[PDB]
Amino acid sequence: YTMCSGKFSIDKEMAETQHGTTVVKVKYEGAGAPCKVPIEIRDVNKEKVVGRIISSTPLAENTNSVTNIELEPPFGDSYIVIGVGNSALTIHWFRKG
Amino acid sequence: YTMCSGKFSIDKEMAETQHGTTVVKVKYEGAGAPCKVPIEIRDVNKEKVVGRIISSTPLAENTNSVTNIELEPPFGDSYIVIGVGNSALTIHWFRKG
């Protein structure tokens, strides 16, 4: 699979789980599915944080499909960008230490 | 910057340099520039190979702009995917050991 080229929207706001992760649900509104949900997690220095995605490589299976994404945000501020281009969405998360 | 959402084409075929790298030039034909050229390098097991991009984070500055990309392919077979979606291009490279 290649990365989805189209727009995503938040289907369920990012929320903390009980086992030290967060989960967010996104709806894929674009074309070219099945395709990989583009997900990048960066710290305050805009540097990528690796290995924090818990879900097996999240896919948008079809146009309008909803995908569950489980993440393990680092401590402090992280900026999670889902999608590509001008329609990419950013989620700011703060994890208290 | 976010990742470019649009189509790229090969402007200059991937070629070996003298100092143990390769260089390929791509033309960005899409919108939303300036944006980051999406580049992933995977091995035969389709696993990402990290730290092989020599160029500072390649950008497409504008629609129709041409970007120079210097890479350090791993030994053996690597598959370099530029772009996203159904218009993403794949380059197969073999590096003799």
Swiss-Prot record, chains A, B:
Membrane topology: Multi-pass membrane protein
Post-translational modification comment from the UniProt entry: N-glycosylated.
Disulfide bridges in this chain: C4-C35
Subcellular locations according to the entry: Virion membrane; Host endoplasmic reticulum membrane
Biological role stated in the UniProt entry: Binds to host cell surface receptor and mediates fusion between viral and cellular membranes. Envelope protein is synthesized in the endoplasmic reticulum in the form of heterodimer with protein prM. They play a role in virion budding in the ER, and the newly formed immature particle is covered with 60 spikes composed of heterodimer between precursor prM and envelope protein E. The virion is transported to the Golgi apparatus where the low pH causes dissociation of PrM-E heterodimers and formation of E homodimers. prM-E cleavage is inefficient, and many virions are only partially matured.
Assembly: Homodimer; in the endoplasmic reticulum and Golgi. Interacts with protein prM. Interacts with non-structural protein 1.
Protein name from the UniProt record: Envelope protein E
Organism: Dengue virus type 4 (strain Dominica/814669/1981) (DENV-4)
First and last residues shown, out of full length: 578 to 674 of 3387
